[PDB]
Amino acid sequence: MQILLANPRGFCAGVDRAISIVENALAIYGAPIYVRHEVVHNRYVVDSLRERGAIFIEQISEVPDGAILIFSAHGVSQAVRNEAKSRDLTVFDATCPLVTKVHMEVARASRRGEESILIGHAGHPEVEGTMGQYSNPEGGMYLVESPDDVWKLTVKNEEKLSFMTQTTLSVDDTSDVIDALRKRFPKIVGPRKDDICYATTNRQEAVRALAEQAEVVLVVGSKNSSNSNRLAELAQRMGKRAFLIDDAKDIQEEWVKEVKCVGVTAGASAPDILVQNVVARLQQLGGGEAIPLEGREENIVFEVPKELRV
Amino acid sequence: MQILLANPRGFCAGVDRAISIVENALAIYGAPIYVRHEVVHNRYVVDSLRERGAIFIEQISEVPDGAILIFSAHGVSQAVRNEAKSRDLTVFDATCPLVTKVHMEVARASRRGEESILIGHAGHPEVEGTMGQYSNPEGGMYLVESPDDVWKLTVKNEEKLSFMTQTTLSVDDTSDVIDALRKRFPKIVGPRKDDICYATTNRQEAVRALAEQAEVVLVVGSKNSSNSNRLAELAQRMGKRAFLIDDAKDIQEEWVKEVKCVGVTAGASAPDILVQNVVARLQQLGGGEAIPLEGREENIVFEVPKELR
Numbered sequence A: 001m002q003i004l005l006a007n008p009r010g011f012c013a014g015v016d017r018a019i020s021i022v023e024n025a026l027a028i029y030g031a032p033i034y035v036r037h038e039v040v041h042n043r044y045v046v047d048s049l050r051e052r053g054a055i056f057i058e059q060i061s062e063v064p065d066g067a068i069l070i071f072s073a074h075g076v077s078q079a080v081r082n083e084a085k086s087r088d089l090t091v092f093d094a095t096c097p098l099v100t101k102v103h104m105e106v107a108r109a110s111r112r113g114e115e116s117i118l119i120g121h122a123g124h125p126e127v128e129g130t131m132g133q134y135s136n137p138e139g140g141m142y143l144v145e146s147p148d149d150v151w152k153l154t155v156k157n158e159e160k161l162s163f164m165t166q167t168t169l170s171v172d173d174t175s176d177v178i179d180a181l182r183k184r185f186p187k188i189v190g191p192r193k194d195d196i197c198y199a200t201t202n203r204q205e206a207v208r209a210l211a212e213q214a215e216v217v218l219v220v221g222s223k224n225s226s227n228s229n230r231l232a233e234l235a236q237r238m239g240k241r242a243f244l245i246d247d248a249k250d251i252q253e254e255w256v257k258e259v260k261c262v263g264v265t266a267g268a269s270a271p272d273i274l275v276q277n278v279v280a281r282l283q284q285l286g287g288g289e290a291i292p293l294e295g296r297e298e299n300i301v302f303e304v305p306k307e308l309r310v
Numbered sequence B: 001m002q003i004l005l006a007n008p009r010g011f012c013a014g015v016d017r018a019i020s021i022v023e024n025a026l027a028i029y030g031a032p033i034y035v036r037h038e039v040v041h042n043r044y045v046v047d048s049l050r051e052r053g054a055i056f057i058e059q060i061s062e063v064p065d066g067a068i069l070i071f072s073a074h075g076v077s078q079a080v081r082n083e084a085k086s087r088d089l090t091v092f093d094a095t096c097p098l099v100t101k102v103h104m105e106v107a108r109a110s111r112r113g114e115e116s117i118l119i120g121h122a123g124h125p126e127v128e129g130t131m132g133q134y135s136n137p138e139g140g141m142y143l144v145e146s147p148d149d150v151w152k153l154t155v156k157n158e159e160k161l162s163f164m165t166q167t168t169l170s171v172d173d174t175s176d177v178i179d180a181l182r183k184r185f186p187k188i189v190g191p192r193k194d195d196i197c198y199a200t201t202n203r204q205e206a207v208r209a210l211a212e213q214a215e216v217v218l219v220v221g222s223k224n225s226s227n228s229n230r231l232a233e234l235a236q237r238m239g240k241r242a243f244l245i246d247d248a249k250d251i252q253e254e255w256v257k258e259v260k261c262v263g264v265t266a267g268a269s270a271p272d273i274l275v276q277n278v279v280a281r282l283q284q285l286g287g288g289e290a291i292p293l294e295g296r297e298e299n300i301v302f303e304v305p306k307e308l309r
Ligand SMILES: CC(CO)CCOP(=O)(O)OP(=O)(O)O
Pocket: A014, A015, A039, A040, A041, A042, A073, A074, A096, A099, A126, A167, A168, A224, A225, A226, A227, A228, A267, A268, A269
């Protein structure tokens, strides 16, 4: 059985930074270090940080005065940020810069009292945070998840409209939504394409090339990871059997029995060691040496704040 | 005399990457290493690289077959790139990712035969490289440097128009140009704001804060550095005397005599050691300890290609 590895895969610049922010805070200040919501959506990472003293909380009110608090890479609303600022706490913002970029545009629109439309999935922490950057009653902030949502959306002044997007969406599906938005609101303004980050675009591109060769595609990632789910869905929609797994232990013999070519990739929040273990498991299941596919080279890095340098 | 230092200042992610690309290529393949155009617009850096064996040229003709060629951080046209590929040359691209981003948009408009307008300064290498990404005769690629240029521009089809900008422009001036573009061509499409990079925006914001405190501003940067010139220009427009200098030796006493507050900053292509030397000179001229102003923390880094690490 041939094992192919998607490229790129795994850790993105934002996730590497966020994890290091927590690890260094713990290394420099010791336990406990409080973190608002999972720093990244990966159970292995979250379990590891908890084992080292990190305490994940739901609300800032749970954090004691004088403590160190970290905001997750997905971002937080202005209400959350301001609350933490008024508190006697040392705060480190692990929000990815690529998410912060979208936040600033939303705050700008709210400032001008002009309505904005966010393309994203309700309930996701990044959506909560981005929608949370808008607070002008005279304007408006709306969420759409599909063309159907656009088709039924009502706006106060479509003459002054702008749109933004979640950073981990399906490139193809988002294209459909944008097309619907421009047909419905011809004067709507936005970025050249969307706010889907380089990492999401690249990983979906890479899994597309992977799915063309592999019969089965394994995507290392947690159930609550948006970008990881998109990787698995893309493969499935291409007609291949795809599985979203947290680690090698989740692999069932039945999945790869008689399979001649199995592909493996990982969401932006999944550590490379998980992939290494998956490869090891597949090999004892008949797989050979893992073959990395040729892929677009990524060179972006986001440094942790100077204070947390180690 | 009080010495203030702007923040951020100096090296950006693209410049640091580009210089490392040349340094690494010299260590790996040895001299000589050909580089198309000054890797970054800084005399000190360029002079030093010549030392280690780097040879800077403007045309691919100047480069012998079998040689290693590196494109500068400013970028190159498709014509140059293809001319280099048609030759038996080993190529490494030090173009900054933020410049490449603009290139890709121009190529897209070219492939669709749809016109594009670039806001920038004629003759600059980045402008030549970006304009050089357009090759479809059906459409068009036009350069505008001011609102007046916009007022006199006519296109084939303004219903399918888009714009891009140089990465090192004056934030304020570019705003004026875009306002003109939108009034002239109401259906024009572009980014949310412009293509001016984070480094340029941050250094201009920082020099603005520096100038509101300093009577005189010294900008460390070479004459041909676009972004560096914009820093001195900004301070000057604020009514302060500002000088663009390559090093401490260029400082003329009269500039800071009896001056109570002098500010120092550096363009994106100027090494920190130059700033340290400038501060040292100001101190022997009566200045005290250099005080860093509070500023936007930058955290972006661009890695060199694995092939050169
Ligand atoms: C922090 C982000 C959002 O940009 C992505 C990184 O991966 P996850 O940690 O799994 O987050 P998401 O579920 O939003 O893809």
